[PDB]
Design a protein around this ligand. Structure first.
Ligand code: NAG
Ligand code: NAG
Ligand code: NAG
Ligand code: NAG
Lengths: 337, 406, 185, 48, 48
């Protein structure tokens, strides 16, 4: 698993700090050179993710491709890697193995289209859940640059991607070698002789089909790669959880609620207690921006590594050791996580 | 006055809801009948589920000091609370410093120690001559309270009270000391520890008018009933017409802001307040026999799509359906929310400056209008495998040089 | 951010020590300076921690620049997509603010043609010797089998220089006549 | 850095809780021990 | 650490390090092949 992006979150400094109380907002007008800096910093961090995602998908585009059968391309079965088809491919975009990968990952639906209305009706006590707690705490989760439909097309084209023969130097010719014949060249190069009983075709495809078909079992927390998939989701949720939990810190005041402060204190001293909540919730937001900047750069430096393995051992066979899996490397496939 | 081109995340009269019970008047009569008690023999009144009239209390006393910690007298005067605890006694004004927190005298040691667990107010006041509270004889206070022990009765252990409690030397003279420095001796029983209890009392000359001390404490969340000032019922008593509206609520001693919806009952009906794991009200058993869900007040998000070159702007209501926008150009529902200011001409683009997210785009078509557009995936060259004994191949016939800058 | 963190009140009446000294008694002045002193050190600790993250990030990026100089600039790279886009020819490096600016010159074709491009050529003989092309394709005259380069289309006669001896296969094309010079006898 | 942040007054009269207990009244004791708790927790968060 | 004059001495010397390449197996020898001839060997390797 290679992480290429983080969840894009933006914050409203005048809603997180003062929860719609006009008594609090008037004291925040003295501030507001510290709110713009938070708003402008988050806009830039989210802007840089868009440029990192655009760059990633231009380094993994394919110049030309050839067409593959639904399964049993030669004797090798690639069905797990292809979108289901009854007649021709209906009912979605993501391959069969993306269905199994996503179903085993616990992700809260961010509801990019009708999130406000769904949280408005349902969730009687689930209206502080990290996704429904964003119209309360004043932050927002931005949608990703590309829809899952186009993100699926970039990885689909990689499956049928064509390259220059296999013994020709350079990256400027494309040979339409069938997938079955391509695999035999990859096995031939690594030391297997071409007299190995017609290269034992019935007994290499079967072992290829067995190992490729048995990868569904690997979607458990016992697996290292899938464990990292869940940790990436957990980290995104934990950033929102800490954003909401800082609105319950008193910061030395009588309460974390401005309603209580305005109801138990006199006018002169209320302004003293509210300001402790404004001096906090702004330092905390300064820590959020600092945290999410480092996560935004870390993902962007891992998107470069994501593009590398697409070019080193997806678009061509890799002669490197350990870089692209244990054992001698034959072929690799990439899907969306 | 000049902002770059991009999508920018920019930033109604909350009402009131009050359900308070129909409750009987709080009775202060026990305070006004009998000789006023001494500082070490103070008397406590607990008020719950009742109403008080502030005008009577203002008329009957003349306040001299009101040192408050955690609350203010105005808050107690305009708010409703679960429990009200009053500790009253007779205390000379001339010793008003000896009852302060931090005092080094004998009042906090043997007579009365104030507790600061809850919001409190210490009020030293004087009773007008017309008000009928029988004045004591001269004031009194305990100056020593210790347990004598040892075979020769030679070691003495001072005894100190706890915040809000009574002294153990109270029983020597509950109504007062006949002479200054009056000394008392008692023998403790075996179960009480044993030994010689020794007490000393100090007599302070009586003043011209009665002067008294009060400690007023408020408790929140200590019942399903409220102590309230007398007030009009008004029109904010009901919520059935105002579901879906953000209101400041004051319900039986708990105050806040929220929106009330109608759900199925959960929790215990007796307790009347359902809380989540973080001590926030989430349910309320109203007196009308309905259980209302309490949600925090929410705000619709707004973003601005701006093009500097053409000076065009549109508004994105992220993740909000257009039906809500109309009820609270023409709004258009997209895959990222409701958009006002974009037109759907079924435009398709290959690459564009403004991304809206989820493969949407806003492109300012020349000749002055934003148009909503959808990014289209450019399919690579599908090289046809013509039938033959070899593999069909693509070989360049013309080339160029491109410099990539990093 | 360093300069703008000095205009933070931190709960004091003002961010200026001049105004604190000009409005408050000696007992209360020291209580308001200490708010500015406990702040402005929390903000400096934030600066110190932030400048250690930025500095190590640039120190690790220096190894990336050093590695890419040794690969793209001092030699020709056979990696895919490491040194620009397209097959790599030559790269040049110049100084830029706080780093290195590279110019990766690559060979990008613009027009294409389609050919037959057989896998190999087997001798029509017992114990057959089979020639596979090297760094190119065996293309028909469209029979006479010729050779062209992989990156540019130019048919040439086959010879021993552009042919590599490989074992026979069923997928190869048997040559009854018109044998190339390498395969004759 | 973790241990040296336990000697920071955070605006209290003293860093040690023993000094705060031995020099102030019960009303103000819990207002400055609370200063040491709002600090020493932000400090721990920066460590995390 | 370095002034612009010395910072650009290193990069100016990289343009002329074609003699530092020394096309062989290994990096321990140097060949004074002109720039024009090196490009034709670079283009010859990639397929032309
Ligand atoms: C290929 O694998 C799929 C996975 O279920 C299976 O249904 C299909 O029968 C396999 N192909 C063949 C030819 O058996
Ligand atoms: C409080 O007492 C005054 C005294 O006359 C009276 O006018 C007023 O109506 C009382 N408030 C009530 C009964 O709510
Ligand atoms: C509130 O309770 C239910 C909602 O589930 C329904 O009967 C109606 O909306 C309300 N009932 C009454 C009696 O108003
Ligand atoms: C534009 O309108 C057409 C037909 O009215 C509809 O099919 C299409 O989905 C619309 N586009 C958007 C972005 O709503």
């Amino acid at each position: 698993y290679i992480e290429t992006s983080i969840q894009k979150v933006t914050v409203d400094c005048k809603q997180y700090v003062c929860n719609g109380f006009t008594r609090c907002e008037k004291l925040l007008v003295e501030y507001g050179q510290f709110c713009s800096k938070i708003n402008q910093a988050l806009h830039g961090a989210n802007l840089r993710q868009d440029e990192s995602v655009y760059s990633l998908y231009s380094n993994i585009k394919t110049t030309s491709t050839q067409t593959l059968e639904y399964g049993l391309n030669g004797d090798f079965n690639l069905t797990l890697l292809q979108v289901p088809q009854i007649g021709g491919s209906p009912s979605g975009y993501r391959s069969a193995i993306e269905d199994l990968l996503f179903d085993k990952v616990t992700i809260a639906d961010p509801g990019y289209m009708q999130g406000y209305d769904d949280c408005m009706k349902q969730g009687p006590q689930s209206a502080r859940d990290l996704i429904c707690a964003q119209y309360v705490s004043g932050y927002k989760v931005l949608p990703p640059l590309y829809d899952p439909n186009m993100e699926a097309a970039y990885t689909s084209s990689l499956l049928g991607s064509i390259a220059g023969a296999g013994w020709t130097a350079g990256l400027s010719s494309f040979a339409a070698i069938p997938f079955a014949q391509s695999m035999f060249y990859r096995l031939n190069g690594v030391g297997i002789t071409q007299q190995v009983l017609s290269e034992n075709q019935k007994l290499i495809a079967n072992k290829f089909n067995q190992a490729l078909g048995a990868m569904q079992t690997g979607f458990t927390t016992s697996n290292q790669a899938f464990s990292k998939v869940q940790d990436a989701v957990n980290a995104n949720a934990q950033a929102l959880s800490k954003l909401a939990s800082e609105l319950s810190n008193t910061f030395g005041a009588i309460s974390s609620s401005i309603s209580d402060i305005l109801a138990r204190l006199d006018t002169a001293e209320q302004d003293a207690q509210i300001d402790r909540l404004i001096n906090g919730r702004l330092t905390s937001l300064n820590a959020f921006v600092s945290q999410q900047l480092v996560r935004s750069e870390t993902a962007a430096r891992s998107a470069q590594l994501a593009s590398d393995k697409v070019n080193e051992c997806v678009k061509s066979q890799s002669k490197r050791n350990g870089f692209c899996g244990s054992g001698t490397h034959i072929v690799s496939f990439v899907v969306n996580a | 006055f000049e902002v770059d081109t991009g999508v920018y995340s920019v930033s109604s009269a909350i009402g009131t809801f009050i359900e308070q019970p129909n409750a009987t008047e709080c009775d202060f009569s026990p305070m006004f009948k009998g000789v006023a008690p001494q500082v070490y023999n103070f008397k406590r009144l607990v008020f719950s589920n009742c109403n008080y009239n502030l005008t009577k209390l203002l008329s009957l006393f003349a306040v001299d000091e009101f040192s408050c910690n955690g609350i203010s007298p105005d808050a107690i005067a305009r708010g409703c609370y679960s429990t009200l605890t009053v500790d009253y006694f007779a205390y000379p004004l001339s010793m008003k410093s000896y009852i302060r927190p931090g005092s080094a005298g004998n009042i906090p040691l043997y007579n009365y120690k104030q507790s600061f667990a809850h919001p409190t107010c210490r009020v030293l006041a004087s009773v007008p001559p017309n008000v009928t509270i029988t004045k004591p004889e001269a004031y009194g206070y305990i100056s020593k309270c210790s347990r004598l022990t040892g075979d020769y009765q030679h070691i003495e252990t001072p005894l100190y009270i706890n915040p809000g409690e009574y002294s153990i030397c109270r029983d020597f003279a509950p109504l007062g000391f006949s002479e200054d420095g009056q000394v008392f001796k008692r023998t403790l029983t075996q179960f009480e520890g044993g030994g010689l209890l020794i007490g000393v009392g100090t007599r302070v000359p009586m003043t011209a008018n009665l002067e008294m001390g009060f400690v007023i404490s408020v408790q929140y969340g200590a019942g399903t009933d409220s102590v309230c000032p007398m007030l009009d019922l008004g029109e904010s008593s009901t919520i059935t017409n105002r579901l879906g509206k953000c209101v400041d609520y004051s319900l039986y001693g708990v105050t806040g802001r929220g929106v009330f919806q109608n759900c199925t009952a959960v929790g215990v009906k007796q307790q009347r307040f359902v809380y989540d794991s973080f001590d926030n009200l989430v349910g309320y058993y109203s007196d009308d026999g309905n259980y209302y869900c309490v949600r925090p007040c929410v705000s619709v998000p707004v973003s601005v799509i701006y093009d500097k070159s053409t000076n065009l702007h549109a508004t994105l209501f992220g993740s909000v359906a257009c039906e809500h926008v109309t009820t609270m150009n023409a709004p258009l529902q997209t895959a990222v929310g409701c958009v006002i200011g974009l037109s759907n001409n079924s435009l398709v683009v290959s690459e564009c400056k403004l991304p809206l997210g989820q493969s949407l785009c806003a492109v300012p078509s020349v000749s002055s209008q934003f148009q909503l557009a959808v990014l289209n995936y450019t399919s690579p060259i599908v090289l046809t495998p013509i039938n033959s004994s070899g593999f069909t191949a693509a070989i360049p016939t013309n080339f160029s040089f491109s410099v990539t800058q990093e | 951010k360093l300069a703008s963190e000095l205009s933070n009140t931190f709960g004091a009446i003002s961010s200026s020590i001049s105004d604190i000294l000009a409005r408050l008694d000696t007992a209360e002045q020291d209580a308001q300076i200490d708010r500015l002193i406990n702040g402005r050190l929390t903000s400096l600790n934030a600066f110190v921690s932030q400048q250690l993250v930025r500095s190590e990030t640039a120190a690790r990026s220096a190894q990336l620049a050093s590695d890419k100089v040794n690969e793209c600039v001092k030699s020709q790279s056979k990696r895919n997509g490491f040194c620009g886009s397209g097959t790599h020819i030559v790269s040049f490096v110049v100084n830029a603010p706080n780093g290195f600016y590279f110019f990766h010159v690559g060979y990008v074709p613009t027009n294409y043609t389609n050919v037959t491009a057989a896998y190999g050529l087997c001798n029509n003989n017992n114990p057959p010797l089979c020639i596979a092309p090297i760094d190119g394709y065996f293309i028909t005259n469209q029979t006479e089998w010729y050779y062209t380069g992989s990156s540019f289309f130019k048919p040439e006669p086959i010879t021993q220089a552009n042919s590599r001896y490989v074992s026979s296969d069923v997928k190869f094309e048997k040559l009854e006549n018109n044998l190339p010079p390498p395969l004759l006898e």
